[PDB]
């Protein structure tokens, strides 16, 4: 197990490219099984026997570099559990919450996360450090042609793999970015970009995916378009707005370091003086210094702090962590005062050394 | 070479709450200028004249309580005889012809006019009642808990005179406050027992807000902590509001590595004329803004 212990994996703890700004590289392969109903119509019988195909086919068999297969199942996981796993972005709050015989498999690695009884029966998704979007598909599209040769795809050929949900409907295809925008945030450059980004087809979501909010200045571009379109072109697709989208964000930080100067050196080190020192803090001030803090190690004005270990915070400090830290649920106040406590600590430690 | 001598830096009685306490005896063209001639040939004391002071000089003197702004701007004539530990400072050409003033740190009246009207007997034994008694006082928490706009008519009623040391008017900056006035010895001795009255209900409102907001209050006395350790830009306001903070959150101790003489000591640095002094130079208020942070950020690295 230990799923459940680290917050960002030896995997997802690589440098990749782009990996200042690009979090993450998210690709998602949606498909159905033959000769069972979709999650949208099924009974309780299909959904256990869906999950017991899958524990047959995949327990005792590894898969190499990534490891050996785990099945979790949401009805053995406790809440704390669930929600540990869609912070760590291993599974989504549909799955944790509104599925009861939903399922998880995972690599050891933790880079390939299968779901099970979600939206889909199943949703194959491959996690890649920084910007690699054509790496994670050749890993999906291998992975998809081995999970085939042990189970049989409802596919069509002129509608394509079949779907429960219409947004997803031919390919099963999305592929996603996780993006930290402070400056185009700051800039408010963002209420332009996001409709723009909606006209190429691409949607602009939260941290959680969609129902999630914009945390820390974090947020997921991924496409909408599912037909019509081959999975590598549609990656390429991605990668080259993802590319504006960088530069934009890049230059946006020279613009805000040409105008504001010493304003802006002021804003992160007093996000740094709160988590250093505060012993109250909540949700979203967190995720705004932790952000503030990001932007001045990229820029060059705090030294002596990884941004791994932001990146950590982000996600150690959310409620499933920082109970599983405490040890036993925590109340609203309880948290906050946790919450300060975890990112004191954790600088403090930068600091020493 | 420093805002605050080694002789205010000393502990005093009831020095959490008192910072210093003061005493000025009033006592009595060419004729200035033969006075200041007679004391220079009477004094170790070393004497600084106006008229051979720079402008920036003169306000220094005026942010370390040393001379009188009427002195300092309307009195190039005045001069001014200072003690090695400027405990002592002698006035003269101000109001009257000499105005003698003492200092010791914390709460100290009745010592204070004792050396004030020893080395008046001094004077007065070689050359041949306008008493102003006061001390300065950090009272956050009885700003906080909204109480002081109360206890000042009360104040006043009694015949003392209270005035914020660094706030423009009626508003005190940093929550530091100037309290002030018969016999001599019955008026010291008369503003010591007010004196001790504040520090008792200072202390009380000091508990009650530890028994009310607990862990909100850390964090209240630890986030000025941060912001006045790492900030680039602070203006006078917030930098007087989180001292007081800090100082505050060292009284109570959670803030335990760092000398209470930081409020006493940068809130004088953070004048404008040690801040030009700080710098070398003159500065536009956006550059003071940028100085006040710097200087607060290594008086506090000094500690940490
Ligand atoms: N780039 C990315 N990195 C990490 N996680 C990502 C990601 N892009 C999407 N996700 C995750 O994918 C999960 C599902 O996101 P959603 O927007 O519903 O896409 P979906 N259901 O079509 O697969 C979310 O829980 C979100 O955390």
Aim: charged share 25%.
């Amino acid at each position: 197990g230990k799923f459940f212990n680290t917050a960002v994996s030896a995997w997802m703890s690589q440098e990749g490219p782009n990996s200042d700004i690009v979090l993450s590289s998210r690709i998602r392969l949606a498909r159905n099984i033959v000769d069972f109903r979709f999650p949208t119509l099924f009974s309780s019988e299909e959904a256990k026997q869906i999950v017991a195909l899958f524990e047959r086919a995949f327990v005792h068999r590894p898969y190499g570099e990534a490891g050996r297969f785990e099945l979790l199942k949401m009805s053995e996981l406790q809440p704390i559990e669930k929600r540990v796993l869609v912070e760590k972005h291993l599974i989504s709050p549909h799955l944790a919450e509104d599925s009861p015989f939903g399922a998880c498999l995972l690599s050891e690695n933790e880079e390939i996360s299968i779901m099970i009884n979600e939206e889909d029966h199943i949703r194959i998704q491959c996690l890649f450090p920084g910007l690699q979007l054509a790496e994670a598909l050749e890993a999906a599209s291998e992975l998809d042609d081995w999970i085939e040769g042990h189970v049989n795809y409802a596919f069509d050929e002129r509608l394509g793999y079949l779907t429960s949900c219409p947004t997803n409907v031919g390919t099963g295809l999305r592929a996603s970015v996780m993006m930290h925008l402070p400056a185009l945030v700051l800039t408010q450059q963002i209420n332009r970009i996001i409709p723009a980004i909606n006209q190429l087809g691409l949607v602009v979501r939260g941290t959680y995916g969609e129902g999630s909010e914009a945390l820390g200045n974090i947020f997921q571009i991924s496409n909408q378009i599912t037909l019509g379109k081959s999975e590598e072109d549609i990656v390429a697709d991605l990668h080259t707005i993802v590319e504006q989208l960088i530069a934009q964000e890049r230059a946006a930080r020279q613009a805000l370091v040409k105008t504001l100067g010493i304003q802006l050196e002021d804003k992160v080190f007093r996000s740094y003086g709160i988590l250093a020192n505060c012993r109250v803090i909540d949700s979203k001030e967190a995720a705004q210094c932790l952000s503030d803090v990001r932007l001045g190690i990229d820029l060059g004005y705090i030294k002596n702090v990884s941004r791994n270990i932001l990146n950590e915070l982000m996600i150690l400090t959310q409620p499933g962590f920082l109970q599983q830290y405490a040890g036993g649920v925590l109340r609203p106040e309880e948290r906050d005062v946790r919450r300060a406590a975890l990112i004191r600590e954790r600088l403090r430690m930068e600091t020493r050394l």
